[PDB]
Design a protein around this motif. Structure first.
Motif, PDB file in Angstrom:
ATOM      1  N   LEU A   1     -71.851 111.258  31.276  1.00  0.00           N
ATOM      2  CA  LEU A   1     -72.546 110.697  32.457  1.00  0.00           C
ATOM      3  C   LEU A   1     -74.006 110.423  32.104  1.00  0.00           C
ATOM      4  O   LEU A   1     -74.663 111.269  31.517  1.00  0.00           O
ATOM      5  N   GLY A   2     -74.497 109.250  32.484  1.00  0.00           N
ATOM      6  CA  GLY A   2     -75.797 108.745  32.014  1.00  0.00           C
ATOM      7  C   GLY A   2     -75.649 107.592  31.006  1.00  0.00           C
ATOM      8  O   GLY A   2     -76.530 106.727  30.916  1.00  0.00           O
TER       9      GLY A   2
ATOM     10  N   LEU B   1     -74.354 104.055  29.479  1.00  0.00           N
ATOM     11  CA  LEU B   1     -74.037 102.776  30.113  1.00  0.00           C
ATOM     12  C   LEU B   1     -73.706 101.825  28.994  1.00  0.00           C
ATOM     13  O   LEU B   1     -74.369 101.853  27.953  1.00  0.00           O
TER      14      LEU B   1
ATOM     15  N   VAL C   1     -69.958 101.940  33.263  1.00  0.00           N
ATOM     16  CA  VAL C   1     -70.747 103.159  33.541  1.00  0.00           C
ATOM     17  C   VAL C   1     -69.873 104.371  33.108  1.00  0.00           C
ATOM     18  O   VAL C   1     -68.815 104.556  33.646  1.00  0.00           O
TER      19      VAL C   1
ATOM     20  N   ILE D   1     -68.307 107.848  33.226  1.00  0.00           N
ATOM     21  CA  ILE D   1     -68.159 108.890  34.235  1.00  0.00           C
ATOM     22  C   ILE D   1     -67.988 110.307  33.594  1.00  0.00           C
ATOM     23  O   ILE D   1     -68.669 111.288  34.022  1.00  0.00           O
TER      24      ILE D   1
ATOM     25  N   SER E   1     -73.579 115.911  37.347  1.00  0.00           N
ATOM     26  CA  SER E   1     -74.056 114.888  38.284  1.00  0.00           C
ATOM     27  C   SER E   1     -75.094 115.350  39.361  1.00  0.00           C
ATOM     28  O   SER E   1     -74.972 116.481  39.930  1.00  0.00           O
ATOM     29  N   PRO E   2     -76.049 114.447  39.731  1.00  0.00           N
ATOM     30  CA  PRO E   2     -76.349 113.110  39.129  1.00  0.00           C
ATOM     31  C   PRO E   2     -77.073 113.154  37.779  1.00  0.00           C
ATOM     32  O   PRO E   2     -77.549 114.195  37.358  1.00  0.00           O
ATOM     33  N   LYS E   3     -77.101 112.018  37.065  1.00  0.00           N
ATOM     34  CA  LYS E   3     -77.973 111.890  35.910  1.00  0.00           C
ATOM     35  C   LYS E   3     -79.107 110.872  36.299  1.00  0.00           C
ATOM     36  O   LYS E   3     -78.814 109.717  36.626  1.00  0.00           O
TER      37      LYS E   3
ATOM     38  N   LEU F   1     -81.988 108.458  35.455  1.00  0.00           N
ATOM     39  CA  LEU F   1     -82.655 107.709  34.383  1.00  0.00           C
ATOM     40  C   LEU F   1     -83.991 107.203  34.955  1.00  0.00           C
ATOM     41  O   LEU F   1     -84.012 106.294  35.816  1.00  0.00           O
TER      42      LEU F   1
ATOM     43  N   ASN G   1     -87.302 105.375  34.740  1.00  0.00           N
ATOM     44  CA  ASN G   1     -88.001 104.270  34.039  1.00  0.00           C
ATOM     45  C   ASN G   1     -89.170 103.608  34.807  1.00  0.00           C
ATOM     46  O   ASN G   1     -89.953 102.813  34.212  1.00  0.00           O
ATOM     47  N   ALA G   2     -89.271 103.881  36.113  1.00  0.00           N
ATOM     48  CA  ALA G   2     -90.259 103.196  36.981  1.00  0.00           C
ATOM     49  C   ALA G   2     -91.710 103.423  36.460  1.00  0.00           C
ATOM     50  O   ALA G   2     -91.939 104.403  35.772  1.00  0.00           O
TER      51      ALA G   2
ATOM     52  N   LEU H   1     -88.540 101.122  41.654  1.00  0.00           N
ATOM     53  CA  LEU H   1     -87.696 100.099  41.010  1.00  0.00           C
ATOM     54  C   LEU H   1     -87.700 100.307  39.490  1.00  0.00           C
ATOM     55  O   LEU H   1     -88.754 100.491  38.893  1.00  0.00           O
ATOM     56  N   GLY H   2     -86.522 100.295  38.866  1.00  0.00           N
ATOM     57  CA  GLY H   2     -86.421 100.622  37.436  1.00  0.00           C
ATOM     58  C   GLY H   2     -85.579 101.881  37.298  1.00  0.00           C
ATOM     59  O   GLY H   2     -84.844 102.059  36.318  1.00  0.00           O
TER      60      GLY H   2
ATOM     61  N   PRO I   1     -76.592 107.113  37.728  1.00  0.00           N
ATOM     62  CA  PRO I   1     -75.115 107.267  37.618  1.00  0.00           C
ATOM     63  C   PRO I   1     -74.660 108.580  38.267  1.00  0.00           C
ATOM     64  O   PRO I   1     -75.371 109.620  38.144  1.00  0.00           O
ATOM     65  N   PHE I   2     -73.525 108.538  38.936  1.00  0.00           N
ATOM     66  CA  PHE I   2     -73.028 109.770  39.649  1.00  0.00           C
ATOM     67  C   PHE I   2     -71.509 109.885  39.747  1.00  0.00           C
ATOM     68  O   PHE I   2     -70.774 108.881  39.672  1.00  0.00           O
TER      69      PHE I   2
ATOM     70  N   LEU J   1     -72.713 103.949  40.478  1.00  0.00           N
ATOM     71  CA  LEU J   1     -74.121 103.758  40.122  1.00  0.00           C
ATOM     72  C   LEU J   1     -74.984 103.432  41.373  1.00  0.00           C
ATOM     73  O   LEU J   1     -74.616 102.565  42.178  1.00  0.00           O
TER      74      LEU J   1
ATOM     75  N   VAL K   1     -78.807 102.106  42.172  1.00  0.00           N
ATOM     76  CA  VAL K   1     -79.982 101.374  41.658  1.00  0.00           C
ATOM     77  C   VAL K   1     -81.102 101.662  42.673  1.00  0.00           C
ATOM     78  O   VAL K   1     -81.011 101.218  43.833  1.00  0.00           O
TER      79      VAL K   1
ATOM     80  N   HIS L   1     -92.995  95.162  43.315  1.00  0.00           N
ATOM     81  CA  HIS L   1     -92.868  95.739  41.948  1.00  0.00           C
ATOM     82  C   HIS L   1     -91.760  95.089  41.066  1.00  0.00           C
ATOM     83  O   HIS L   1     -91.343  95.676  40.054  1.00  0.00           O
TER      84      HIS L   1
ATOM     85  N   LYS M   1     -88.144  94.610  37.360  1.00  0.00           N
ATOM     86  CA  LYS M   1     -88.497  95.605  36.373  1.00  0.00           C
ATOM     87  C   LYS M   1     -87.582  95.420  35.161  1.00  0.00           C
ATOM     88  O   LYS M   1     -86.363  95.588  35.282  1.00  0.00           O
TER      89      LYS M   1
ATOM     90  N   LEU N   1     -85.760  96.408  31.807  1.00  0.00           N
ATOM     91  CA  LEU N   1     -85.443  97.557  30.983  1.00  0.00           C
ATOM     92  C   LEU N   1     -84.921  97.057  29.619  1.00  0.00           C
ATOM     93  O   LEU N   1     -83.786  96.564  29.509  1.00  0.00           O
TER      94      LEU N   1
ATOM     95  N   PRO O   1     -83.273  95.407  37.110  1.00  0.00           N
ATOM     96  CA  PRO O   1     -83.212  95.636  38.569  1.00  0.00           C
ATOM     97  C   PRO O   1     -84.248  94.811  39.352  1.00  0.00           C
ATOM     98  O   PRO O   1     -85.376  94.552  38.865  1.00  0.00           O
TER      99      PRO O   1
END
Ligand code: NA
Lengths: 173, 173, 173
Positions: free
Chosen positions: A30-31, A33, A57, A59, B16-18, B20, B22-23, B30-31, B35-36, B55, B57, C15, C18, C20, C35
């Motif tokens: 998980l994580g 992609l 994704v 799982i 879960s969750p993971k 990520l 990046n914002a 946003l960014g 994933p869950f 997922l 976003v 914003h 974004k 990635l 995104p």
């Protein structure tokens, strides 16, 4: 119901799959992609039609079945005919059914489910779409008797080489 | 129109969750991607059915509501019966409705919308699907009168410990 | 079939997008994820309706067209009216059609296809939904005669200034 079969083949020339490794384990988890894109051919293997395009994704790793469960969101492109969209389970270790979420062009209004058959990792998959809702009967160039799925299938040399007789017009690339 | 209710619960045993992250911002922005996968139980809490998987976003932090806006693509798995797919708004701070994008198995042809109730953010969610297009009436073991949604709801002790009487056939894990 | 047109505009205040970056390439390539969220106005440009929200997955760079193929999964938000969801191709260099995967609210049960017109890259886009399956006629405040798309189009001053007269009720933000 109109049945439509296609082969998805990875020819190692579209930079695919791209693994985005975010889970700390050496195995998928998980994580992680996986954007991807492969070549798409008719169920009879006679013609190049287009490409697949989307995202898997991760799982969970499934160590007992020596495989991975993905949740997949992607489309199937048929040159000037249009496209089909799907959403559901993608298991490396066994066959599955995905939802048909819609389409466009000849596939405008499409619904139902699609069977996904895993043949060879990471190069060969086979699909059968159980298509409802279409405005017309599918064009004959897409509805030839399919080649029965096995590890040994190959596209027609004409289709792999992109000869006029081995492609549909304006096939997606 | 056939009503189906389910409880999704994060038992913190599925990695879960993971997140990520990046914002540009310190806070969610946003960014960011999440994933869950959570466990899924019947509306009456008697049986384990399967899992959710997909997922979220991140769209924007919502400081005047003390939470976040997500855009979600995910599926609901029901062991042997098949799955249902959705897309739409996931708001940490209030209830929302998502589009039903399709299904497979008994859920082949599914359309409509589903109500998402943020019961205890982020650990307990209660859903009500307003399902149209199914071939047949839903199986009875999935349509027991739902337990009214409240903060202290719990699965049946047999559902939690995976005893035959508390699981559906080949429930998803 | 009920036609609905809308303008999507990036006003540089959300914003967005974004980028990635994961492709080992100076250009966009597979592994790059985008995104995004933009503002949405009526087809006649008279009112602010809401926002778009979702994800573009880069499939390939298209050197001969000086642009990119994305695979896009996103929603269109219309305040208290509900939302539409879509999936399909987003080509930076030409128009496309995407699949309408579903809806909620007044768009519960929506299906069909949507035309995406590339007006100014990537800041103004004009869409026409060919909507089937709606339970009722679309609200009149959403169905004013569209302004023909051009590079020079602009929302009405009242809409941009967020006056009651230039917005739908509880417009998404
Ligand atoms: Na229908």
């Amino acid at each position: 119901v109109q049945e439509l079969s296609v082969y998805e083949i990875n020819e190692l020339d579209r930079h695919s799959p791209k693994i985005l490794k975010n889970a700390f384990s050496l195995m998928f988890g998980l994580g992680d992609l996986v954007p991807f894109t492969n070549k798409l051919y008719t169920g009879d293997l006679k013609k190049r039609v287009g490409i697949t395009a989307g995202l898997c994704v991760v799982i969970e790793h499934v160590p007992e079945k020596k495989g991975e469960r993905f949740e997949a969101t992607y489309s199937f492109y048929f040159g000037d005919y249009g496209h089909l969209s799907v959403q559901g389970p993608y298991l490396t270790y066994e066959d599955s059914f995905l939802a048909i979420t819609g389409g466009a062009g000849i596939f405008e209004g499409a619904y139902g489910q699609v069977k996904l058959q895993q043949l060879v990792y990471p190069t060969k998959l086979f699909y059968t779409f159980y298509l409802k809702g279409l405005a017309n009967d599918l064009p004959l160039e897409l509805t030839g008797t399919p080649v029965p799925p096995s590890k040994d299938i190959e596209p027609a040399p004409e289709a792999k080489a992109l000869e006029p007789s081995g492609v549909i017009s304006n096939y997606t690339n």
